[PDB]
Short mmCIF file of C-alpha atoms and ligand atoms in Angstrom, two decimals:
data_model
loop_
_atom_site.label_atom_id
_atom_site.label_comp_id
_atom_site.label_asym_id
_atom_site.label_seq_id
_atom_site.Cartn_x
_atom_site.Cartn_y
_atom_site.Cartn_z
CA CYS A 42 -0.08 -0.05 0.38
CA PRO A 43 1.90 2.70 -0.90
CA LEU A 44 -1.08 5.51 -1.64
CA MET A 45 -3.23 6.11 2.13
CA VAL A 46 -5.79 8.42 2.70
CA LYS A 47 -6.84 9.40 6.15
CA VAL A 48 -9.36 12.12 6.72
CA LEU A 49 -10.72 13.77 10.15
CA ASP A 50 -13.29 15.59 11.05
CA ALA A 51 -12.55 18.63 13.31
CA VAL A 52 -16.96 19.72 14.36
CA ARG A 53 -17.09 16.46 15.49
CA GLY A 54 -13.79 15.25 16.44
CA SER A 55 -14.41 12.12 14.74
CA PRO A 56 -13.33 9.91 11.60
CA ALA A 57 -14.79 11.71 8.51
CA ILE A 58 -16.29 8.87 7.57
CA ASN A 59 -17.77 7.35 4.04
CA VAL A 60 -15.23 10.35 2.31
CA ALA A 61 -15.15 10.42 -1.70
CA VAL A 62 -11.66 10.40 -2.57
CA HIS A 63 -10.42 10.33 -6.60
CA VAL A 64 -6.67 9.96 -7.13
CA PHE A 65 -5.63 11.35 -10.49
CA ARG A 66 -2.50 10.97 -12.40
CA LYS A 67 -0.95 14.02 -15.18
CA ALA A 68 -0.95 12.46 -18.76
CA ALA A 69 1.88 13.00 -21.39
CA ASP A 70 -0.38 15.52 -22.62
CA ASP A 71 -1.06 17.45 -19.51
CA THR A 72 -4.50 15.81 -18.52
CA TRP A 73 -5.51 14.40 -15.57
CA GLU A 74 -6.30 11.29 -16.15
CA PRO A 75 -8.01 9.28 -13.55
CA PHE A 76 -5.58 6.51 -11.46
CA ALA A 77 -8.35 5.13 -8.41
CA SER A 78 -10.53 6.16 -5.97
CA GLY A 79 -12.36 5.07 -2.87
CA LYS A 80 -14.14 6.22 0.26
CA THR A 81 -12.76 6.05 3.61
CA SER A 82 -13.83 3.59 6.09
CA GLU A 83 -15.67 4.05 9.43
CA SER A 84 -11.66 4.09 10.66
CA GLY A 85 -11.51 7.47 8.15
CA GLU A 86 -8.81 5.26 6.37
CA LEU A 87 -8.69 4.38 2.73
CA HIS A 88 -6.13 1.60 2.22
CA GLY A 89 -5.74 -0.22 -1.10
CA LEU A 90 -5.73 2.36 -3.75
CA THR A 91 -2.79 1.38 -5.63
CA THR A 92 -0.33 -1.15 -5.89
CA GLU A 93 4.02 -0.64 -5.83
CA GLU A 94 3.69 -1.69 -9.74
CA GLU A 95 0.69 0.57 -10.41
CA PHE A 96 2.15 3.60 -8.61
CA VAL A 97 4.74 4.72 -10.64
CA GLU A 98 6.75 8.45 -11.17
CA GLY A 99 4.36 11.55 -11.97
CA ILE A 100 2.62 14.43 -10.87
CA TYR A 101 -0.23 13.29 -8.94
CA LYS A 102 -3.90 14.50 -7.88
CA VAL A 103 -5.84 13.50 -4.29
CA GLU A 104 -8.77 14.87 -4.50
CA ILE A 105 -10.94 14.21 -1.21
CA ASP A 106 -15.06 14.85 -2.24
CA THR A 107 -15.54 17.39 0.98
CA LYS A 108 -18.81 19.14 -0.04
CA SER A 109 -20.03 15.65 -0.54
CA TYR A 110 -19.24 14.76 2.93
CA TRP A 111 -20.62 18.02 4.33
CA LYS A 112 -23.87 18.03 2.63
CA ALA A 113 -24.62 13.90 3.61
CA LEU A 114 -24.24 15.58 7.04
CA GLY A 115 -26.72 18.46 6.33
CA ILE A 116 -24.28 20.87 6.25
CA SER A 117 -23.58 23.36 3.19
CA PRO A 118 -19.94 24.50 3.01
CA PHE A 119 -17.35 26.31 1.25
CA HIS A 120 -15.03 24.35 -0.63
CA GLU A 121 -16.26 22.26 -3.55
CA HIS A 122 -13.11 19.51 -2.52
CA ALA A 123 -9.61 19.06 -1.11
CA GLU A 124 -6.83 18.61 -3.28
CA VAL A 125 -3.58 17.53 -3.23
CA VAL A 126 -1.17 17.56 -6.24
CA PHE A 127 2.22 16.81 -5.61
CA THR A 128 5.24 14.97 -7.15
CA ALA A 129 5.88 11.14 -6.23
CA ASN A 130 8.34 8.41 -6.75
CA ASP A 131 11.04 10.32 -8.39
CA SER A 132 13.64 9.84 -6.29
CA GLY A 133 12.20 6.01 -6.27
CA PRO A 134 9.26 4.39 -4.78
CA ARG A 135 8.09 6.28 -1.18
CA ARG A 136 4.95 4.87 1.04
CA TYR A 137 2.89 8.18 1.11
CA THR A 138 -0.43 8.71 3.83
CA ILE A 139 -2.33 12.24 2.46
CA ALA A 140 -3.91 13.28 5.93
CA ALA A 141 -6.58 16.04 5.41
CA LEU A 142 -8.59 17.24 8.30
CA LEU A 143 -11.62 18.84 7.61
CA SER A 144 -14.17 21.95 8.84
CA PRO A 145 -16.94 23.78 6.69
CA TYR A 146 -15.00 26.88 6.07
CA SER A 147 -11.28 25.59 6.53
CA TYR A 148 -9.20 22.57 6.06
CA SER A 149 -5.16 21.18 6.52
CA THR A 150 -3.41 18.51 4.94
CA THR A 151 -0.07 17.18 5.11
CA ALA A 152 1.91 14.28 3.49
CA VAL A 153 3.39 11.81 5.60
CA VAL A 154 6.38 9.93 3.24
CA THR A 155 8.05 6.92 4.59
CA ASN A 156 10.80 5.03 2.93
CA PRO A 157 10.40 0.75 2.51
CA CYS B 179 -12.47 44.01 -4.59
CA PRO B 180 -14.83 40.81 -3.54
CA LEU B 181 -11.81 38.46 -3.91
CA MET B 182 -8.46 39.17 -1.76
CA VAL B 183 -6.18 36.37 -1.71
CA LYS B 184 -3.70 36.15 1.86
CA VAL B 185 -0.85 33.38 2.71
CA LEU B 186 1.57 33.03 5.05
CA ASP B 187 4.45 31.24 6.01
CA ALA B 188 5.32 28.53 8.71
CA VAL B 189 8.81 27.70 9.22
CA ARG B 190 9.65 31.62 8.84
CA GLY B 191 7.03 33.24 10.90
CA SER B 192 6.28 35.37 7.89
CA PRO B 193 3.96 36.62 5.24
CA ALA B 194 4.81 34.83 1.85
CA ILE B 195 5.86 37.11 -0.49
CA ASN B 196 6.00 37.24 -4.35
CA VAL B 197 4.31 34.38 -4.65
CA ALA B 198 2.20 33.69 -7.79
CA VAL B 199 -1.98 32.96 -7.53
CA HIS B 200 -3.12 31.68 -10.77
CA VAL B 201 -7.81 31.99 -9.84
CA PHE B 202 -9.98 29.99 -13.08
CA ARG B 203 -13.39 29.80 -13.27
CA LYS B 204 -15.36 26.87 -14.22
CA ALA B 205 -16.70 26.82 -18.12
CA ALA B 206 -19.81 25.06 -19.10
CA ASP B 207 -17.51 22.15 -20.45
CA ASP B 208 -15.57 21.86 -17.24
CA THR B 209 -12.54 23.05 -18.26
CA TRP B 210 -10.99 25.97 -15.98
CA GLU B 211 -10.51 29.39 -17.56
CA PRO B 212 -7.87 31.57 -16.79
CA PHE B 213 -9.93 34.43 -14.64
CA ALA B 214 -7.37 36.54 -12.52
CA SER B 215 -4.18 36.36 -11.39
CA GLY B 216 -1.13 38.24 -9.88
CA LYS B 217 1.82 37.80 -7.17
CA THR B 218 1.09 38.57 -3.07
CA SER B 219 2.94 41.56 -1.75
CA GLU B 220 5.66 42.51 0.77
CA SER B 221 2.36 42.15 3.35
CA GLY B 222 1.34 38.08 2.10
CA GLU B 223 -1.84 39.73 0.32
CA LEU B 224 -3.28 39.89 -3.40
CA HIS B 225 -5.63 42.58 -3.69
CA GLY B 226 -7.29 43.86 -6.94
CA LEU B 227 -7.80 40.66 -8.58
CA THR B 228 -11.69 41.17 -9.43
CA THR B 229 -14.46 43.72 -9.36
CA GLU B 230 -17.91 42.99 -8.37
CA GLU B 231 -19.15 42.98 -12.05
CA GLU B 232 -16.55 40.27 -13.01
CA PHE B 233 -16.87 38.06 -10.05
CA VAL B 234 -20.03 36.57 -10.75
CA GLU B 235 -21.53 33.18 -8.40
CA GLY B 236 -19.84 29.89 -10.50
CA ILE B 237 -17.08 27.76 -9.41
CA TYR B 238 -13.35 29.01 -8.98
CA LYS B 239 -9.96 27.39 -8.29
CA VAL B 240 -7.29 29.56 -6.53
CA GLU B 241 -3.74 28.15 -7.28
CA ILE B 242 -1.32 29.65 -5.32
CA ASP B 243 2.55 28.34 -6.71
CA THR B 244 3.95 27.09 -4.09
CA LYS B 245 6.86 24.84 -5.37
CA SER B 246 8.17 28.43 -6.34
CA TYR B 247 8.23 29.78 -3.66
CA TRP B 248 9.72 27.29 -1.43
CA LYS B 249 12.34 26.43 -4.21
CA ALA B 250 13.58 30.36 -3.93
CA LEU B 251 13.57 29.87 -0.37
CA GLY B 252 15.97 27.49 -0.34
CA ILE B 253 14.02 24.58 1.18
CA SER B 254 12.60 21.27 -0.46
CA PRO B 255 8.45 21.01 -0.66
CA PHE B 256 6.38 18.34 -1.32
CA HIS B 257 3.04 19.79 -2.99
CA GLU B 258 3.42 21.17 -6.75
CA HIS B 259 1.01 23.88 -5.83
CA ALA B 260 -1.92 24.77 -3.62
CA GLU B 261 -5.39 24.48 -4.77
CA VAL B 262 -8.16 25.94 -3.44
CA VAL B 263 -11.78 25.16 -5.41
CA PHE B 264 -15.24 27.12 -4.13
CA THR B 265 -18.10 28.40 -5.47
CA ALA B 266 -19.32 31.39 -5.18
CA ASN B 267 -22.86 32.21 -3.67
CA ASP B 268 -25.09 35.06 -3.80
CA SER B 269 -26.92 34.45 -0.89
CA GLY B 270 -23.68 34.84 1.36
CA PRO B 271 -21.82 37.78 2.28
CA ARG B 272 -20.01 39.83 -0.41
CA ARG B 273 -16.30 39.72 0.21
CA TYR B 274 -14.25 36.81 0.51
CA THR B 275 -10.58 36.43 1.57
CA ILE B 276 -9.01 32.94 1.36
CA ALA B 277 -5.79 32.49 3.34
CA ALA B 278 -3.37 29.86 3.40
CA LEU B 279 -0.47 28.92 5.77
CA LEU B 280 2.05 26.97 3.74
CA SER B 281 4.57 24.70 5.81
CA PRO B 282 6.99 22.54 2.99
CA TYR B 283 4.24 19.00 3.55
CA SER B 284 1.38 20.83 4.30
CA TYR B 285 -0.99 23.51 4.12
CA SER B 286 -4.24 25.17 5.90
CA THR B 287 -6.78 27.17 4.64
CA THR B 288 -9.47 28.96 5.39
CA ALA B 289 -12.30 31.43 3.54
CA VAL B 290 -13.39 34.31 5.47
CA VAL B 291 -16.25 35.37 4.06
CA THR B 292 -18.23 39.14 5.02
CA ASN B 293 -20.55 41.73 4.57
CA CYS C 92 1.32 47.87 19.55
CA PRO C 93 3.94 45.54 19.32
CA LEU C 94 1.66 42.19 19.82
CA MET C 95 -1.84 41.72 18.14
CA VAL C 96 -3.89 38.74 18.50
CA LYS C 97 -6.19 37.66 15.52
CA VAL C 98 -9.07 35.41 15.77
CA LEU C 99 -10.94 33.26 12.91
CA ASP C 100 -13.80 31.42 12.86
CA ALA C 101 -13.47 27.39 10.45
CA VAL C 102 -16.57 26.37 10.83
CA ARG C 103 -18.98 29.88 10.36
CA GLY C 104 -16.09 31.34 7.94
CA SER C 105 -15.59 34.69 9.33
CA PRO C 106 -13.31 36.38 11.76
CA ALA C 107 -14.73 35.30 15.39
CA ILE C 108 -16.26 37.87 17.28
CA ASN C 109 -15.79 39.43 20.84
CA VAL C 110 -13.78 36.08 21.85
CA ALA C 111 -11.86 37.51 25.45
CA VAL C 112 -8.17 37.20 25.30
CA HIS C 113 -5.39 37.19 27.94
CA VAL C 114 -2.04 37.52 28.02
CA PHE C 115 -0.11 36.65 30.51
CA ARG C 116 4.08 36.88 31.60
CA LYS C 117 5.99 34.70 33.06
CA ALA C 118 7.10 35.85 36.38
CA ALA C 119 10.41 34.43 38.28
CA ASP C 120 9.07 32.13 40.31
CA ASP C 121 7.71 30.18 36.90
CA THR C 122 4.33 31.89 37.87
CA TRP C 123 2.20 33.28 35.10
CA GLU C 124 1.19 36.57 35.82
CA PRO C 125 -1.53 39.20 33.88
CA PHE C 126 0.01 41.42 31.54
CA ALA C 127 -2.94 42.48 28.88
CA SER C 128 -6.73 41.01 28.00
CA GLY C 129 -9.37 42.39 25.82
CA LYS C 130 -12.20 40.65 23.53
CA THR C 131 -11.60 40.61 19.99
CA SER C 132 -13.24 42.60 17.69
CA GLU C 133 -15.73 42.57 15.10
CA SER C 134 -12.74 42.56 12.51
CA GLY C 135 -11.62 38.76 14.87
CA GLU C 136 -8.71 41.35 15.56
CA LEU C 137 -7.71 42.52 19.37
CA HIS C 138 -5.21 45.90 19.36
CA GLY C 139 -3.70 47.93 21.86
CA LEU C 140 -2.74 45.27 24.34
CA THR C 141 0.91 46.26 24.83
CA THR C 142 3.29 49.13 24.11
CA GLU C 143 7.01 48.67 22.86
CA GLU C 144 7.96 49.94 26.74
CA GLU C 145 6.25 47.52 28.04
CA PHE C 146 6.85 44.52 26.12
CA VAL C 147 9.80 43.20 27.30
CA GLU C 148 11.63 39.91 26.69
CA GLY C 149 10.33 37.52 28.48
CA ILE C 150 8.02 33.90 28.14
CA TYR C 151 4.18 34.96 27.06
CA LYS C 152 0.90 33.04 26.94
CA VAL C 153 -2.37 33.76 25.18
CA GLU C 154 -5.13 32.18 26.26
CA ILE C 155 -7.92 32.75 23.88
CA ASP C 156 -11.27 31.55 25.76
CA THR C 157 -12.75 29.51 23.22
CA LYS C 158 -15.00 27.12 25.07
CA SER C 159 -17.04 30.46 25.86
CA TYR C 160 -17.08 31.46 22.08
CA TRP C 161 -18.89 28.70 20.72
CA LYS C 162 -21.36 27.94 23.23
CA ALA C 163 -22.41 31.50 22.87
CA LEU C 164 -22.70 30.24 19.06
CA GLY C 165 -24.54 27.08 20.56
CA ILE C 166 -21.94 24.73 19.19
CA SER C 167 -20.41 22.63 21.33
CA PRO C 168 -16.30 22.54 21.88
CA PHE C 169 -13.74 20.07 22.97
CA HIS C 170 -11.48 22.64 24.66
CA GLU C 171 -11.18 24.81 27.50
CA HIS C 172 -9.18 27.30 25.47
CA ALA C 173 -6.63 27.83 23.37
CA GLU C 174 -2.89 28.82 24.49
CA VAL C 175 -0.06 30.12 22.96
CA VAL C 176 2.79 29.98 24.78
CA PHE C 177 5.98 31.70 23.32
CA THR C 178 9.17 33.53 23.84
CA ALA C 179 9.59 37.02 22.87
CA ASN C 180 12.79 37.97 21.29
CA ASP C 181 14.64 40.83 20.07
CA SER C 182 17.10 39.82 17.69
CA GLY C 183 14.26 39.08 15.81
CA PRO C 184 11.25 41.50 14.12
CA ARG C 185 9.48 43.40 16.67
CA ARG C 186 6.05 43.38 15.47
CA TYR C 187 4.39 39.96 16.53
CA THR C 188 0.85 38.70 15.61
CA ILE C 189 -0.69 35.44 17.07
CA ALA C 190 -3.14 34.06 14.68
CA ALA C 191 -5.48 31.54 15.57
CA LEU C 192 -8.14 29.45 13.40
CA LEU C 193 -10.46 28.20 15.49
CA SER C 194 -13.01 24.39 15.36
CA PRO C 195 -14.97 22.97 17.46
CA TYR C 196 -12.75 19.96 18.20
CA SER C 197 -9.48 21.60 16.85
CA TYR C 198 -7.38 24.93 16.34
CA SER C 199 -4.55 25.98 14.49
CA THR C 200 -2.70 28.88 15.44
CA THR C 201 0.88 30.60 13.99
CA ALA C 202 3.23 33.45 14.83
CA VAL C 203 4.08 36.68 11.78
CA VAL C 204 6.44 38.26 12.90
CA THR C 205 7.72 41.30 10.86
CA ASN C 206 9.57 44.69 10.64
CA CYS D 300 -5.11 3.33 26.34
CA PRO D 301 -7.83 5.86 26.40
CA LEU D 302 -5.42 8.70 25.63
CA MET D 303 -3.28 8.19 23.24
CA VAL D 304 -1.19 11.18 21.18
CA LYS D 305 0.27 11.56 17.92
CA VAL D 306 2.99 14.21 16.17
CA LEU D 307 3.61 14.99 12.44
CA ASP D 308 6.00 17.21 11.23
CA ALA D 309 4.99 19.21 8.68
CA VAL D 310 8.77 20.56 7.20
CA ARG D 311 10.33 17.05 6.58
CA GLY D 312 7.10 14.96 6.02
CA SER D 313 7.47 12.75 8.83
CA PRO D 314 6.25 11.72 12.50
CA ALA D 315 7.56 13.51 14.84
CA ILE D 316 10.05 10.77 16.62
CA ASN D 317 11.22 11.66 20.41
CA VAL D 318 8.17 14.40 21.06
CA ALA D 319 8.24 15.05 25.38
CA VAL D 320 4.59 15.43 26.22
CA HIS D 321 3.52 15.77 29.91
CA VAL D 322 -0.04 15.73 30.69
CA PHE D 323 -1.52 17.77 33.97
CA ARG D 324 -5.26 17.39 35.08
CA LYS D 325 -6.59 20.56 37.73
CA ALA D 326 -6.68 19.83 41.10
CA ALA D 327 -9.38 20.71 43.70
CA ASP D 328 -6.97 24.00 45.01
CA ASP D 329 -6.60 24.84 40.68
CA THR D 330 -3.57 23.80 40.48
CA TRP D 331 -1.98 21.84 38.08
CA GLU D 332 -0.98 18.94 39.26
CA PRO D 333 1.06 16.15 37.24
CA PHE D 334 -0.46 12.77 35.46
CA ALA D 335 1.24 11.45 33.07
CA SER D 336 4.24 11.64 31.18
CA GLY D 337 6.19 10.35 27.84
CA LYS D 338 8.07 10.58 24.71
CA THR D 339 6.88 9.51 21.14
CA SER D 340 7.95 6.77 19.27
CA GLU D 341 10.07 6.54 16.02
CA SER D 342 6.16 6.58 14.55
CA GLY D 343 5.07 9.44 15.87
CA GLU D 344 2.88 7.74 18.78
CA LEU D 345 2.39 8.14 22.69
CA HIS D 346 0.74 4.93 23.65
CA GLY D 347 0.84 4.07 27.85
CA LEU D 348 0.17 7.40 29.39
CA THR D 349 -2.73 6.54 31.67
CA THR D 350 -5.13 3.93 32.78
CA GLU D 351 -9.15 3.85 32.65
CA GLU D 352 -8.94 3.76 36.03
CA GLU D 353 -6.68 6.36 36.70
CA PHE D 354 -7.95 8.87 33.78
CA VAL D 355 -10.95 10.05 35.96
CA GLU D 356 -13.42 13.07 35.12
CA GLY D 357 -11.05 15.95 34.95
CA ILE D 358 -9.41 19.09 33.45
CA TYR D 359 -6.63 17.99 31.67
CA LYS D 360 -3.44 19.99 29.83
CA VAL D 361 -1.71 17.60 27.52
CA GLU D 362 1.84 19.99 26.88
CA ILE D 363 3.45 18.76 23.72
CA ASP D 364 7.47 19.92 24.13
CA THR D 365 8.10 21.39 20.35
CA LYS D 366 10.76 23.48 21.18
CA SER D 367 12.79 20.91 22.69
CA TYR D 368 12.00 18.84 19.52
CA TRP D 369 12.77 21.59 16.77
CA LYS D 370 16.40 22.40 19.24
CA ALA D 371 16.97 18.60 18.83
CA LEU D 372 16.48 19.13 14.85
CA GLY D 373 19.13 22.46 15.07
CA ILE D 374 16.10 24.64 14.68
CA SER D 375 14.80 27.82 16.58
CA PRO D 376 11.13 27.59 16.74
CA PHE D 377 8.63 30.36 18.10
CA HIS D 378 6.38 28.35 20.46
CA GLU D 379 7.38 26.94 23.91
CA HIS D 380 5.16 24.01 23.66
CA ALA D 381 2.02 22.71 22.25
CA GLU D 382 -1.01 23.01 24.77
CA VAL D 383 -4.32 21.09 24.81
CA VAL D 384 -6.53 22.36 27.10
CA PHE D 385 -9.81 19.63 27.49
CA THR D 386 -12.35 18.30 30.10
CA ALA D 387 -12.18 14.80 29.73
CA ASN D 388 -15.27 11.67 30.66
CA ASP D 389 -17.84 14.28 31.89
CA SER D 390 -20.40 11.77 30.39
CA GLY D 391 -18.38 8.65 30.96
CA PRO D 392 -15.32 7.51 29.88
CA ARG D 393 -14.40 8.15 26.20
CA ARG D 394 -11.16 7.39 24.58
CA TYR D 395 -8.86 10.66 23.41
CA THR D 396 -6.39 10.99 20.57
CA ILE D 397 -4.76 14.88 20.57
CA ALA D 398 -3.07 15.25 17.26
CA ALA D 399 -0.64 17.83 16.69
CA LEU D 400 1.05 19.16 13.16
CA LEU D 401 4.13 20.78 13.63
CA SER D 402 6.04 23.23 12.05
CA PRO D 403 8.80 26.37 13.72
CA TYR D 404 6.41 28.93 13.44
CA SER D 405 2.67 27.37 13.18
CA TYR D 406 1.01 24.27 14.85
CA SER D 407 -2.34 22.46 14.48
CA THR D 408 -3.77 20.13 16.83
CA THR D 409 -7.04 17.95 16.57
CA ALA D 410 -9.13 15.80 18.97
CA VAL D 411 -10.76 12.20 18.19
CA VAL D 412 -13.11 11.26 20.73
CA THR D 413 -14.69 7.57 20.64
CA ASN D 414 -16.50 5.77 23.42
CA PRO D 415 -15.71 2.49 23.42
C1 LIG E 205 -3.66 18.11 8.51
C2 LIG E 205 -3.75 17.26 10.09
C3 LIG E 205 -3.10 15.95 9.98
C4 LIG E 205 -3.40 15.79 10.95
C5 LIG E 205 -3.42 13.93 11.22
C6 LIG E 205 -4.19 12.89 12.41
C7 LIG E 205 -3.95 12.16 11.97
C8 LIG E 205 -2.85 10.95 11.20
C9 LIG E 205 -2.73 9.31 11.19
C10 LIG E 205 -2.22 8.96 10.60
O1 LIG E 205 -2.65 7.53 9.45
O2 LIG E 205 -1.11 9.71 9.93
C11 LIG E 205 -3.66 9.37 12.22
C12 LIG E 205 -4.21 10.00 13.23
N1 LIG E 205 -5.23 9.03 14.20
C13 LIG E 205 -5.16 7.42 14.55
C14 LIG E 205 -5.85 9.70 15.43
C15 LIG E 205 -4.11 11.10 13.26
C16 LIG E 205 -3.74 16.04 12.11
C17 LIG E 205 -3.61 17.64 12.64
C18 LIG E 205 -3.62 18.26 13.69
C19 LIG E 205 -3.84 18.39 10.94
O3 LIG E 205 -3.48 19.24 10.58
C1 LIG E 206 -3.54 29.39 11.91
C2 LIG E 206 -4.16 30.08 10.60
C3 LIG E 206 -3.89 30.88 10.29
C4 LIG E 206 -4.47 32.11 9.38
C5 LIG E 206 -4.38 33.75 9.05
C6 LIG E 206 -5.08 34.02 8.16
C7 LIG E 206 -5.52 35.79 8.17
C8 LIG E 206 -6.43 36.46 7.38
C9 LIG E 206 -6.24 37.91 7.82
C10 LIG E 206 -7.36 38.74 6.94
O1 LIG E 206 -7.06 40.12 6.93
O2 LIG E 206 -7.92 38.34 6.28
C11 LIG E 206 -4.84 38.97 7.99
C12 LIG E 206 -4.33 37.93 9.03
N1 LIG E 206 -3.74 38.40 9.76
C13 LIG E 206 -3.45 39.87 10.44
C14 LIG E 206 -1.62 37.85 10.16
C15 LIG E 206 -4.31 36.08 9.06
C16 LIG E 206 -4.89 31.20 8.49
C17 LIG E 206 -4.64 29.89 8.49
C18 LIG E 206 -5.10 29.23 6.99
C19 LIG E 206 -5.08 29.45 9.46
O3 LIG E 206 -4.84 28.14 9.19
#
């Protein structure tokens, strides 16, 4: 599992469960190709997005569908999504955790990058 | 101006000065059309991006070129850029400030929407 | 004024208005002595806390009464208060802004230190 | 383990390892009594601070020694520590994770509270 996403809710003090996440990879022609997608579990985690074979070097975009999350809770939020765009694996394979902490009008995101 | 951008640096404890910021508006075919851009001032602010007449309801993306900012300071960054995507809604307050707080491997962003 | 406090609300997307803020200075016996206090304005800011003559090097604590803020808005909060503890250093820049971004179960804080 | 602390480094993109953490509990006389302490592991986590017997209702302060962390990395940071003050267990026992994300001039903190 070289790519994991973790999402927390700053209003509830809980994991953000059932959050849709879409990952894109920039293609040769500079468009964003779908790469993988999933949704967070009861613990706010999304495992199993990709494999070390498929997760090659590239520029990746992790789109966390925050609007749909808040709307399902009955809240009208500010942002459409939280986006995280980064070059991956450019000095060899790494493991990436992308974490996000959500509020209706704000979010924060961080990356934890480790070398297997 | 109905749209202001403020950028801060969490490593140096300072405004993020001379950061490129690009604003896009989502077009009918779901593509992102350039809308406004500029660089942040000595106070980390970018004023004058648009006018009330131009800034209609729609989906907007603010892209902050964080990678170039960090590189100009000699610091190794994670992200290509920081992106903030939101809907402008006339039912809410009329002035939008998009604030971002930057670190090499993280960022925070908030909206301050006032009348 | 060498010390300003700015408070924002991440739930409403607004300044955090009428929030009590208390500043303390660490005394020789390691106790916290009251130094300055006030409430944030309509812009979420608290100006005029101190003067250059009064604000000497030392360890300071800024306590933001977040629990009362959230309760006055009808929102259930986690923290008793948000605390920011730092050393004022004359070797660095001369104006300190302590900024805080509040959510019910989280907060962010940064320092903007400029000349 | 009803109280866990997790600390991340926003400069390195890593767990914050070897961070000292001190927990205090407000006593009857309004002073801060030492309650427990420890340091984060290689994963940025601190487990084993307390037990469900000892972790009674009260007002707790979790002090994360950020200054000492940054100084050990050769960096002069702004804050002395990151402090998190909260009432715990007032509607019965809960499990609390206090997470912090550190930069030299900034930090963010959140709580994840779950009911066993
Ligand atoms: C963006 C951000 C992430 C975090 C991440 C917290 C966290 C991260 C992990 C992880 O897998 O890296 C796990 C947990 N748990 C287990 C609560 C919590 C915390 C704060 C305060 C933040 O502002
Ligand atoms: C902790 C924190 C502070 C800020 C600060 C925003 C800010 C906004 C204004 C404003 O005029 O809207 C002013 C300032 N100042 C005065 C530093 C700061 C932003 C984010 C995303 C944060 O996580």
